[PDB]
């Protein structure tokens, strides 16, 4: 069948071992596949997300001098308006991720405020301590939101609870103020946010947006919380996120940020992104 | 890119056949040439139709007046001498100067192939009735 015979190449002063096994393959059914991607120090530290360990003096020194990361991210995004840099979608992504680091925690709290008919009186130290503890356990990942919610509603309140509820409520829906003042109170007294207001604002906002939705305070049991299958990030419930003939061959041809810029072997007629072919006249 | 397939052998007795064919092709070409030179010179000497277009002016005008007068009394001998071939006719009209600038600009002349017809031509079909065995380049009667 005239099978292609490839001679193996041994490491060389300019052609090291890992280079060989990565850039060269002796099995020629594996030629012309596609490009592969790897990472070194910083892109790997981002991707792999290995939480550091506390350690001896240097790590604690670095915890001390740490300062505000939320403001740092923002500075670094903003700094793309400096004359010598561009405005980066990555710098913005890092900004975003630090603004939303808690996020879902707030989301959880929404459900405890709005998703529960008659959660007792939420001012009383008892139910309050239930709420406090469960919140601190949703943050710091000790519990799943589902488990914490099912805990919250099944938490112990008071004997003959329903029959006491018949002495206040008709159809068993209490008033939601005590709940929100409580759920803001917890996030404030827990240290959840670096800047104090953010707790209250986010919790409030997320409710006000959902107020306009059809059947706002009910949720399908499966999509309400963490489960195997989920909703797309636009539809998640209290979430923050709620030519033309020639274009596939054009691709590169706009104003395009690149990663690896194209090269002359791999692109025949492309001139580079900066090029302006039909220039206008400007003073 | 296919490997070119080899050309077959020449043939037999073909060298003599070809020698012969070209040879008598030339001996024929001699009578072709002779006949055509006769036809060409014969054309050159014989008379032709008037090269001007009588549908425009200064020609449409009645043959008793205007240009034709200038032609009858002053130019006649000259025009008949060159047998109304369009090149010397136009050139003579240039040199007579009493028309002067107009010969090219205002006046209008029959297209090349029509102006080439023999004197006394009646129907246009006469363009395609000229002999086709002769090589004069449409310069034969």
């Amino acid at each position: 069948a005239k099978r292609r015979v490839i001679v193996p190449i041994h490491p060389t002063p300019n052609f090291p071992a890992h280079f060989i096994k990565s850039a060269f393959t002796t099995d020629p059914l594996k030629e012309k596949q596609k490009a592969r991607f790897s990472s070194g120090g910083e892109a790997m530290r981002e991707v792999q997300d290995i939480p550091k360990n506390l350690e001896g003096e240097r790590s604690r020194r670095d915890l001390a001098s740490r300062g505000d990361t939320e403001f740092q991210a923002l500075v670094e995004f903003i700094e793309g308006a400096s004359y010598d840099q561009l405005i980066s979608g990555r710098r913005f992504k890092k900004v975003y991720d630090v603004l939303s680091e808690n996020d879902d925690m707030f989301i959880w709290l929404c459900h405890t405020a709005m998703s529960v008919l008659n959660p007792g009186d939420m001012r009383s130290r008892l139910i309050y301590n239930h709420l406090r503890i469960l919140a601190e356990s949703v943050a710091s990942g000790e519990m799943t939101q589902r488990t914490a919610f099912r805990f919250f509603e099944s938490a112990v309140r008071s004997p003959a609870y329903r029959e006491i509820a018949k002495r206040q409520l008709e159809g068993g829906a209490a008033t939601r103020l005590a709940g929100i003042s409580a759920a803001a109170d917890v996030m404030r007294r827990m240290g959840l946010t670096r800047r104090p207001m953010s707790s209250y604002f986010e919790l409030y906002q997320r409710i006000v947006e959902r107020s306009e939705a059809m059947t706002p305070w009910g949720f399908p049991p499966l999509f309400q919380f963490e489960e195997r299958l989920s909703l797309e990030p636009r539809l998640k419930f209290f979430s923050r996120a709620s030519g033309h003939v020639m274009t596939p061959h054009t691709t590169l041809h706009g104003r395009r940020i690149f990663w690896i810029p194209p090269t002359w072997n791999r692109a025949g007629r492309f001139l580079g992104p900066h090029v302006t072919l039909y220039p206008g006249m400007t003073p | 890119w296919a490997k070119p397939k080899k050309r077959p052998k020449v043939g037999q007795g073909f060298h003599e056949k070809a020698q012969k064919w070209r040879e008598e092709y030339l001996l024929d070409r001699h009578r072709a040439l002779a006949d055509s030179l006769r036809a060409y010179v014969e054309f050159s000497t014989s008379k032709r139709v008037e090269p001007w277009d009588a549908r425009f002016k200064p020609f449409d005008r009645i043959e008793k007046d205007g240009v034709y007068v200038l032609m009858r009394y002053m130019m006649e001998e000259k025009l008949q001498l060159c047998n109304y071939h369009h090149r010397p006719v136009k050139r003579l009209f240039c040199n007579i100067g009493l028309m002067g600038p107009q010969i090219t600009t205002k006046a209008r002349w029959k297209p090349y192939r029509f102006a080439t017809n023999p004197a006394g031509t009646s129907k246009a079909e006469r363009m395609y009735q000229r002999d086709k065995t002769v090589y004069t380049h449409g310069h034969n009667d």
Binding site: - | R7, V10, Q19, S36
Partner: protein, 142 residues
């Protein structure tokens, strides 16, 4: 090339029907070299001046053992007729010979007296396919 008619058929590509800059085509083949003109007879495919000397090839340049064919640009001279000697020209398939002398030849090149593309077509040099195609053209009878 498809068929190799010569050496070069191995080396050369046709490249479709391809246009060359005016009056430069790599292989000069004068199909028009014999192209009858009564009135233009002395000016067509001949010396741009009548006052020029005959080419190099009308003269013996050096001591020759002898030649097979004289070059096609050698003009026919009255002696070519009179002397009654072999006058050979390289044409295809093999060689053309001036055998039957005439004075109508004189003063033209044998580039002009030799028909480059003959109407006689051997079927022995043709593939069966080629013969079919020539039949399409209404050249070969069938």
């Amino acid at each position: 090339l498809k068929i190799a008619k010569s050496a070069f058929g191995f080396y050369l590509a046709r490249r479709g029907q391809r246009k060359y800059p005016f009056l430069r085509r790599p292989h000069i083949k004068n199909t028009h070299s014999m192209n009858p003109s009564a009135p233009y007879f002395w000016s067509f495919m001949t010396a741009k001046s009548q006052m020029a000397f005959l080419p190099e090839e009308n003269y013996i340049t050096g001591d020759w053992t002898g030649k097979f064919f004289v070059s096609k640009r050698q003009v026919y001279t009255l002696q070519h007729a009179t002397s009654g000697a072999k006058v050979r020209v390289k044409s295809f398939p093999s060689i053309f010979e001036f055998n039957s002398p005439s004075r109508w030849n004189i003063g033209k090149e044998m580039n002009t007296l030799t028909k480059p593309r003959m109407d006689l077509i051997d079927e022995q040099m043709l593939t069966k396919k080629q013969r079919l195609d020539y039949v399409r053209a209404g050249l070969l009878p069938k």
